[PDB]
């Protein structure tokens, strides 16, 4: 009846105005079986990682144009400490294994009031590469404080700026005009999503199961799911009201598994 | 009818909900995914080998390296360049200047109806000649292998090794056609239409899958090395998915507005 | 003894669409199980029946429409009903339909009001079958099929375009405006002006969604257009 | 099933005509649920 | 009357791997019985599951490794796990695997101590999944999967490399070090120095064997490399 | 696991013998001797007689 | 058995298709035993 | 029926050989009546 409270481990979250919980593809997204591509003893969930982890995004401002977006690669967020996120036990255990698989639960929060106008779209895009710079290297924490909100242009629309394999000098460089990771703004509502606007609610909750091309993926590189936020109607408010609303989100892993124990990972 | 679109789930209705009327009959089921994709189509055009070949080197290749280009074709809907998997489709809008021109390919229909994320299916291949009264053959090897490059001497006549091997080789009569089907042999369970992982643990290129294909194909003339002709020849390759399946929705290309 | 037979005139022909199989080469292969992947798609209608955002011109394109403050009798916005029309171009219904030749069933439209919670107003939605000239006033609009939608607690309102055609099935592209391709117009009318309290932003915005109906159906596949790559 | 017209006779065995997944030891349903 | 039929596009083609027979020419022949020959082989796995000797460099190759007397923290010996690696080249497992494309199951390693009966010592065996850099010290080795083996009456000790992979089946050759070809490293550590009584030879030697596991499996034949003739 | 290789006969094991784990599924049987050798291949090249 | 796909029909007789040995009047078993 | 001589065997299925009308839910008779 618009009041709900979600509990897990030693943490609990509530809301004074809810719209429901969206289950992605199945009746019970939590149910899952151990992987069949490894024969060692796996490591199921323990009570110290059944939690909600919270972080902070950049603030929404009226100067933002339409279809500008922000992205958050789920398994990569912990590893890169984006937006101040820190997993503690989950991060420590993820840094000490070779393989990992798990679903997710996410929720976003905003604090608009009845005197504001605007709308935000929140969706979970699978198998995306919005977190990588055109040169092919992951964005540093300094770049986010400059590109507050990612712009939208024909390059993103057509996937013409994807990661690039240098072709050497024996050939002659061609003209690149299309790629498989394009983004089509008008069709983003295909993925599991909820629409957030000033007049109706202040939070959105989505539940998602595991997906991958193999039963399990490498810990340090898998990027199957990604969180997306996009602007549909630019913000506007009467002069004198509260400005620059804040945004926050929380995440929870479900039915994890691990395999291939080893020492702390180190790049080389 | 009153409803809330913010919930994400909206129940489809009919004319009778708000007005007087009735629902229409089913009709036909031509939208079935299995029935839609079982149709042959052109994939690529390649030359015909007349001697032992040298497989192209990896992409960081500098100038001056000797190899054979445009003789091998990959079996995969994804973009490719220089007989190796790629990530961005290419196009030469100014055919001039130095440098070798890179072969390219793509499956226009498949990516025009690529509404999902993962795919799996068998595949049937066919080849056709583009020259009058030509004799040729076609060879194949599975995903994750390589082409042997050497020859043997019989009666002082060199014979390339690709004549023999325990992986299929087929011959056609004058003006004939070659046809056969292949299984799904990649290590991965499904073929990713779009990907965002990395294969190597470091120095990798994100979004470039390693084994998203069925195999590799090439054509050659059944004659010894001593009969290298003076004119190039070409053939055309046709593929046809069989018993297809899809697994997760996605979005379609962006049709630009003039 | 040999069975005597005579091949027909159609021999050695290669037909792409032939409904039959061929000879195997490398059989006896066994593949990994795929029980672990959820959400298998069985028919593309499952995707055709998901709403998506349309587009309009702000003169250079946006999905929403801004309600003005001036007073005039023309329709606020009106677009034809033809799947090849630009407005449906990027929506899933249009994008999928462009790969076929015929269709049936009822199209569906949805709207959502994203203005301040304190606003109040009413709107009129109408659908006009084909005529010599399209409607241009409320008096004319009232006579056709129409409905009244009022701003309240709930934000969205769905509208269904009935399938009224002189023949079963209809063409999905309009080379010329025969009665079998074009099927009238849709238009939106502002019945009453919006009321807002002092110190609130003006000119609220409204949003559109388009999707297939319950009894929608396609037929007769056709080859696709590759111009997008350029 | 599919774009296959024959309905009476099959020459080769199933395991040679098709690929199979090795074991381990109607109307369209909707996608996306709310509760 | 003649049965009318139409041959398909694939006619008069010669396919080497076709799964069918042909016409006989000189039939009705009867051959001697072969009941007297014992030990019929039914599957080449029977031979793949027999241990054989590996090889290393003495700098010019020997199957054993000599235990030094100096003290250092580096692993005594370490080689990768990739069937195309030289160490497995001449062993039966590698030699047979080079003729196929995929594999499953668990590899097996065995050792044997051939030193004087009066010696005593202990050794540590570890297996490290893939990482940015390979292990280089006992502290790191202890964390991975490992076991302790001590010299006693019995001479040999077996070790099993678990099959831990991100996908079913794996490639049997490494054109490039994708995660589907290389699968980490194996290394041996001398936990304690060897103790010998006076007037005994120093630097004992240790021996290696490699074989397939219980649940090993191959798949997808491929043509072989004839370079050995030269 | 302790064993003696000098006896010639050594029993094949699995991952579970010394660690926690389980055995893998069979898979396919492409190693069968009868199935392996039924494939055509080149043998020799010879001339064509034009007289006795 | 073997690399043979047909499973329904055989035209020629067995003694003409194959050679036979004239009479006189599952899991893999191991090779090499110890006692 | 018609100019069709075969009366024993049909290879392809009916729905692929012919077109069908989807459902909805002797001596010659004369044309033109008087009452």
Author numbering:
A (entry chain C): 12 to 279
B (entry chain A): 1 to 258
C (entry chain B), E (entry chain B): 1 to 59, 68 to 238
D (entry chain D), G (entry chain D), H (entry chain D): 14 to 38, 63 to 72
F (entry chain A): 1 to 52
From the paper:
Seneca Valley virus (SVV) is an oncolytic picornavirus that selectively targets cancer cells by recognizing Tumor endothelial marker 8 (TEM8) as the host receptor. SVV has a typical picornavirus capsid with four capsid proteins; VP1, VP2, and VP3 are characterized by a single jelly roll fold, where eight beta-strands form a barrel-like structure that is distributed at the exterior of the virus, while VP4 is located on the interior of the capsid. The structural architecture consists of four capsid proteins forming a protomer, 5 protomers forming a pentamer, and 12 pentamers assembling into a pseudo T=3 capsid, approximately ~32 nm in diameter. We used cryo-electron microscopy to investigate SVV under acidic conditions and in complex with TEM8 at physiological pH, identifying multiple uncoating intermediates.
We used cryo-EM to image SVV particles after incubation at pH 5 and 37°C with purified TEM8 to explore the structural behavior of SVV. For both physiological and acidic conditions, the A-particles were resolved to 3.4 Å, while for the ER-particles, the resolutions were 6.4 and 4.3 Å, respectively. The A-particles obtained in both conditions are expanded by ~5% in diameter compared to the F-particle. This expansion results in reduced capsid protein contacts compared to the F-particle. Inter-pentamer contacts are reduced by 34% and 22% under acidic and physiological conditions, respectively. For the A-particle[P], additional disordered regions without interpretable density include VP1 (G13, S20, and S28), VP2 (D12), and VP3 (E61-S66), while for the A-particle[C], these include VP3 (P60-D67). On the capsid exterior, the A-particle[P] had the following partially ordered regions: the VP1 HI loop (S229), VP1 BC loop (A65), VP1 Loop II (G97), and VP2 residues V59 and D67, while the A-particle[C] exhibited similar behavior showing partially ordered regions: VP1 HI loop (T230) and VP1 Loop II (P95-G97). For the A-particle[C], the disordered regions were on the VP1 N-terminus (E11-S28) and VP4 residues G63 to N66. Density corresponding to TEM8 was not visible on the SVV A- and ER-particles under acidic conditions, suggesting that at low pH, the virus potentially loses the affinity for the receptor or binds transiently. In the SVV A-particle, its genome is reorganized and lacks defined capsid-RNA interactions with the inner capsid surface, likely contributing to the flexibility of the VP1 N-terminus, which is consequently poorly resolved.
